[PDB]
Design a protein around this nucleic acid. Structure first.
Ligand SMILES: [K+]
Ligand SMILES: [K+]
Ligand SMILES: [K+]
Ligand SMILES: [K+]
Ligand SMILES: [K+]
Ligand SMILES: [K+]
Ligand SMILES: [K+]
Ligand SMILES: [K+]
Ligand SMILES: [K+]
Ligand SMILES: [K+]
Ligand SMILES: [K+]
Ligand SMILES: [K+]
Ligand SMILES: [K+]
Ligand SMILES: [K+]
Ligand SMILES: [K+]
Ligand SMILES: [K+]
Ligand SMILES: [K+]
Ligand SMILES: [K+]
Ligand SMILES: [K+]
Ligand SMILES: [K+]
Ligand SMILES: [K+]
Ligand SMILES: [K+]
Ligand SMILES: [K+]
Ligand SMILES: [K+]
Ligand SMILES: [K+]
Ligand SMILES: [Mg+2]
Ligand SMILES: [Mg+2]
Ligand SMILES: [Mg+2]
Ligand SMILES: [Mg+2]
Ligand SMILES: [Mg+2]
Ligand SMILES: [Mg+2]
Ligand SMILES: [Mg+2]
Ligand SMILES: [Mg+2]
Ligand SMILES: [Mg+2]
Ligand SMILES: [Mg+2]
Ligand SMILES: [Mg+2]
Ligand SMILES: [Mg+2]
Ligand SMILES: [Mg+2]
Ligand SMILES: [Mg+2]
Lengths: 253, 126
RNA sequence: GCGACCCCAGGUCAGGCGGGACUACCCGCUGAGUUUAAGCAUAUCAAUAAGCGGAGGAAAAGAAACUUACAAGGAUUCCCCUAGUAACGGCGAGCGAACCGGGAACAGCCCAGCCUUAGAAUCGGGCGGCUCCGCCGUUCGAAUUGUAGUCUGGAGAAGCGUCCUCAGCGGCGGACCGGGCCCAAGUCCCCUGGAAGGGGGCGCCAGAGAGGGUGAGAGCCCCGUUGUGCCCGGACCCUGUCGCACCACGAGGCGCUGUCUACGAGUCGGGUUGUUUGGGAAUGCAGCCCAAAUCGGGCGGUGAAUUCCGUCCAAGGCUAAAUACGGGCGAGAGACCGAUAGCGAACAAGUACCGCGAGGGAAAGAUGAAAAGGACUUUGAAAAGAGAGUCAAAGAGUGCUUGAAAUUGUCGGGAGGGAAGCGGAUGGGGGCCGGCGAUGCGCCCCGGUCGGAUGUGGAACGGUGACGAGCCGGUCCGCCGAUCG
RNA sequence: CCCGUCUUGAAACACGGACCAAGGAGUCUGACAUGUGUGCGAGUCAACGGGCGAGUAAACCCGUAAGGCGUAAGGAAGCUGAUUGGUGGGAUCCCCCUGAGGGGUGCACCGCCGACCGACCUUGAUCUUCUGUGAAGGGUUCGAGUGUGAGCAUACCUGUCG
RNA sequence: UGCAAAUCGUUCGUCUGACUUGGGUAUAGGGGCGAAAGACUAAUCGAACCGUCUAGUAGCUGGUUCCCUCCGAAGUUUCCC
RNA sequence: GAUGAGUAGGAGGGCGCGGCGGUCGCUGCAAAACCUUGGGCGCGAGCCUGGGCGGAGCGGCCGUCGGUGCAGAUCUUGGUGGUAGUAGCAAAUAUUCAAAUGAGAACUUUGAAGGCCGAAGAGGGGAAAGGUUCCAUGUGAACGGCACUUGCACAUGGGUUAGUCGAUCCUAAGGGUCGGGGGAACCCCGACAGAUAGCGCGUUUCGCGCGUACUCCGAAAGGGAAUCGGGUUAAAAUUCCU
RNA sequence: AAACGACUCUCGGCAACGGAUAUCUCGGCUCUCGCAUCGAUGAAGAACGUAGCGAAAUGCGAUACUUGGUGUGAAUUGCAGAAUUCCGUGAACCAUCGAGUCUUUGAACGCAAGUUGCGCCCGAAGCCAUUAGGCCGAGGGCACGUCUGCCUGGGCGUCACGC
């Protein structure tokens, strides 16, 4: 975010003074002088026209937040795990009915694509093109005052392509397609993995990025190479299949 | 996506620049596309509208009309054509302003500068 | 009387310098009270506001008369921490640093004094030349009451060795900055529209789907955006290379020495007074009094004496970077406001207007796509009215998108013996409502269409199992019978 | 009986209110505290800064003997610095029998009493650099201590304070 | 709620002097000036006017904006200029 | 199964407004907003919908954020009522008749009559102050507290002529200053701490002789060089003409 | 006979009053970034003028909504008129800057100021005037404090040489 605040001097650029009691009027301070429509009018009041607002906004409001790195990594791991569930990906609004399999891992040759037409052909081949088409078709003008605040157009989110090779040309090839986002496997962002805080982003992995995932996030047993001393969290339930536990021989006996 | 740091995507700034553009900038802003034949001949897509250019309207109520341009009202962001007019309540005839982006150039008034500009435009396209 | 010097005077003498303006940051001075302490005087507000001056692009500070007491750090500045800590405080209210440690950036230097005396080797002006931000020649003047050169404590002078180091020009590029020019794709078919930029169909570009304009939500109509290519000009600084002469007298570096080794005064320091500081027998500053020293002087956070120890060298000067920045010029953005909001000011706003004056200080945005801004007839003195015309629209007619409430006129319904309104229950009248309120279902006969096994083949596939075997199974298609639904 | 308000008491001869539109008042920030959610855990906290990176105010990564808080307290200070428990109730579980039963188990928490560390007092064999040490033995004294850790970061409501 | 933020009508004091009056000039805020009423100092005077500190502080007065549901008081103790 | 009061106060669950991250939609075959004795849902905050108007955008849902909800505050700004066609129009003696113009005449112009100001004027000029209000022509609207044909209003043009009238010159109370003395400085005192400005004579422009520290501002009434008749313009005159 | 009408009140349609609501925005507010450039060579500010038709705003300075160079390349426009070899030394209420103009003031500088008031000096051209001077005047000079150099001077202040 960027800070906002009203001018600190607004509503106070006057020498207005209260008339006091005895004039059958309120005690609010009033502009001095005469010969103008402004003379005698109230000032300095949050209830006064042209006055100072109650508790004027200030720039030193606490705009930012300092979340623990471990919690950030927990959230990122959760989003990545959810991206592999077809049910959650569908529930998040992505059209994945034509995707061959999830997680969607494609050959590393896609990283060398240079033209947007070739990128579109690759999307069609891998079956992720319907989602991009939905994102393009959802293009529309933002309702409300936001359209005049330099945020004019809104649309749905398409696939997120994760690549593992620095400097790949697929970033240039794909960046112009509406809804399509691109990221490097070493700097994954929760804001893109769970848009709007909702789990199940449709993700297309390159083979190199998918392979690097193990070295980046480690595992339960051993530690990560890219995250010093980090270990993936464990759930409170080893097996979340409640029916299997409830209808087991031991309990039902 | 814009990347140059000295260009702004602000709607307010873009509108202010467009509406306060001087005459020289307005000339470029008031460009029109060339007809198919001229496009093929000159390898050029669009040109600034000139006074003595032949123009065919392609949008609006005068979609089929054509004629020579007779005035380029830059202050009003319009051009006037020979016989594209209308009658007032008085009965007198007045030209109807047409935006250059809504017309097509069928014949250009060629001079040394016009030919040089055409050559410059064609060179980049190759 | 003349001459030399000294001090001073007059010059519209020849040539230079200064004053004032701006405010966000910066430097110096001066300096409150409101307020808090539930009163109030010390305190706090505050080393702040107001007042008076002085600079720059930054300023200021800056190369230890430092920090420390350690196994020691090493100009200045800034950030984090130290730390709401040591300390200060009617020890009340409150106030409150510094060192270490981790980072940003880093850079060191110039003078005065003893030291030419085989000659002031220095500098300014005029004049004349030159490859002219300067150099050379000549002549006057400054200066011995001292200009040059060496030296600055880290050293250094002098002497002896080492043979280690030191001398420019010009061309072409790179780097930095500021500009100029060109360069993708539909305006194809149908419909609604005043106008497609809206819906449907068919195509295309994309390292360009940031943004804006154009008659309604426009990637492909226009300007632009992305990425190349080419062209022009500054900065003479940094950097690579190339062409030529490359001279060590001299000066530096290194080693040695039974020789020297010059260092800032009404200044330091002390007493006292006032102020300030966390600085507490007194932190800094300033007035007055006293007033130093050179085997010495300052500091070592409790005053004093004695003996040691540690650390630096003031009273002269310069210096980029890290840092600050509501002013000026130029840019980019926003979970900000949307005409009683947002700057006072979206407009000929610090304007109109008010005050003798210092000063005070408003209200006020929206026709239409396009003026196409309403010809003409008629009534009227006229403003205008009634017709008529433009437009998609006048139910858009220039204070012209839309047009709430208070309040008012007209028509229609209704009520009314010194309030009205209101809660509850019915009724009269009005208004409204057809998901307001159904017409199907079962069993038979006739006629019309569509399909009919547990049989046999094909296509793909599933449940379970072990995304094996085996078992089981549904959908669709082709045939022999069956003659049913 | 006219609302709003102060009030023991309002319809009041108590104050505001002629009417309508729009504006109009527990907010932001700092220090704490309880509670709750989340991560990790004797640790926790990379956002002072650095490396980068949506060609990028985001996101990602980085703690060398850095630092803060916690991990030890008691004394004004010099200074010294936790010998590691018992017992009565008590949840859960396991056995015998089916009584308001008996045995074993005995977390959390509470009650009671010891022990250890330190301030103070008292005490004193042996060593010892002669002022230190500490075999034994203590106390109606004192502590925001110990007796197998519970914190750190972050979010929000509420409360005190500038 | 005036012709008027001091006026109008009748009446009244003095009227060659300590007389009345124009212009110029001097004295400015804890200051001036005052044959003295705390008078006057631009309708402002027992301390003028203008901007700022300043959103000065108030144990005191007035307001303090949606619904339903549950729970539900106190005017008593001690200390306090 | 039991049960239901609530001021101050606490808490829970919900309704509503505007953004942001997501998601699902609506809209020129008509969005928002507004209007309506249309209809319905909810205890309620509110919500859904018919019809109209409007003519370009808007909504639902999940999180999250805030300058987020009004009947009051002698609250703020703006707008509007009853009062009410009411209070009022009354000081300065006063108007009348005929005609002209004009759509319109108690209010304009001409003539006649009857009155007032009564020379310390309701007459004729100036100073300050104002600034075009001066003169001619014309006039929709506003204004001239009734009215207007009208005008100190509005619009278009015109108009201020100096050797003699003033300023200008002199100095008054006083003001502003050099130097000097104070002052952090803005500034203070003001010829008081001092080599004054310069003035006359003849000239090879040099000499001679005098020379008491302001040769500055300060009066359209103080002092002071000089103009008179006659005539002339719509508006100027001791200024224009003779 | 309390009926029709008037009045008051009330509900509805329409018409008024007023400018709320909704949708907008060449404006504001906030954050971030780059650069370092006023003035006696007369600044900022202040006044007066200037266009064919302008009062204000904007611009400009008697060369006065602009001169000149360069770039672009056919307008400006409310009206009227005039250009332009419009295949070009060339339109533009265009852009940009190197040349040039730049009225009265203002730190403001000859003295003043409620004054376009009051002084002194130099001097191009011209008139006739002739190794002589006169009239006129374009135009420009005359503040203060200081630095360097210079010219002209004063004082037994310190000396020396002569009388
Ligand atoms: K020389
Ligand atoms: K020297
Ligand atoms: K020395
Ligand atoms: K020294
Ligand atoms: K002293
Ligand atoms: K020492
Ligand atoms: K305003
Ligand atoms: K309309
Ligand atoms: K009350
Ligand atoms: K009342
Ligand atoms: K730590
Ligand atoms: K003790
Ligand atoms: K006073
Ligand atoms: K009280
Ligand atoms: K939405
Ligand atoms: K409705
Ligand atoms: K929301
Ligand atoms: K008339
Ligand atoms: K002095
Ligand atoms: K004097
Ligand atoms: K006079
Ligand atoms: K005469
Ligand atoms: K009605
Ligand atoms: K030019
Ligand atoms: K004078
Ligand atoms: Mg400096
Ligand atoms: Mg701490
Ligand atoms: Mg440090
Ligand atoms: Mg020389
Ligand atoms: Mg439209
Ligand atoms: Mg294009
Ligand atoms: Mg109404
Ligand atoms: Mg540490
Ligand atoms: Mg807001
Ligand atoms: Mg008389
Ligand atoms: Mg007249
Ligand atoms: Mg002086
Ligand atoms: Mg005189
Ligand atoms: Mg609005």
């Amino acid at each position: 975010r960027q800070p906002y605040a009203v001018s600190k001097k607004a509503g106070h650029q006057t020498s207005a003074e209260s008339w006091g009691t005895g004039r059958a009027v309120s005690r609010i301070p009033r502009v001095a002088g005469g010969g103008t429509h402004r003379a005698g009018q109230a000032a300095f009041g949050n209830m006064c026209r042209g006055g100072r607002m109650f508790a004027p906004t200030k720039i030193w409001r606490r705009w930012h937040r300092k979340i623990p790195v471990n919690q950030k990594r927990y959230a990122v791991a959760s989003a990545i795990a959810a991206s592999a569930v077809p049910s959650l990906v569908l529930a998040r609004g992505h059209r994945i009915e034509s995707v061959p399999e999830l997680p969607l891992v494609v050959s590393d040759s896609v990283e060398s694509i240079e033209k947007t037409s070739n990128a579109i052909k690759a999307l069609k081949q891998i079956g992720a093109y319907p989602d991009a088409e939905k994102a393009k078709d959802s293009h529309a003008i933002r309702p409300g005052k936001g359209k005049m605040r330099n945020r004019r157009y809104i649309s749905r989110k398409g696939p997120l392509i994760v690549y593992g090779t620095e400097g790949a040309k697929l970033v240039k090839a794909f960046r112009n397609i509406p809804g399509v986002e691109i990221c490097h496997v070493d700097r994954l962002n929760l804001l893109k993995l769970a848009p709007g805080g909702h789990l199940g982003r449709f993700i297309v992995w390159t083979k190199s990025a998918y392979e690097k995932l193990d070295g980046i996030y480690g595992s339960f047993d051993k530690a990560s190479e890219k995250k010093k001393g980090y270990v993936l969290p464990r759930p409170k339930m080893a097996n979340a299949d409640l029916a299997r536990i409830i209808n087991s021989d031991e309990v039902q006996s | 996506m814009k990347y140059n740091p000295r260009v702004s995507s602000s709607r307010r700034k873009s509108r202010k620049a467009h509406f306060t553009a001087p005459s020289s900038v307005r000339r470029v802003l008031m460009s029109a596309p060339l007809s198919s034949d001229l496009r093929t001949k000159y390898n050029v897509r669009s040109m600034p509208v000139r006074k003595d250019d032949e123009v065919q309207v392609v949008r609006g109520t005068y979609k089929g009309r054509e004629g020579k341009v007779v005035q380029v009202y830059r202050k009003k962001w319009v051009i006037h054509i020979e016989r594209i007019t209308r009658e007032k309540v008085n009965g007198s005839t007045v030209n109807v302003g047409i935006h250059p982006s809504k017309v097509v150039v069928t014949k250009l008034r060629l001079d040394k500068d016009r030919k040089s500009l055409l050559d410059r435009k064609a060179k980049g396209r190759a």
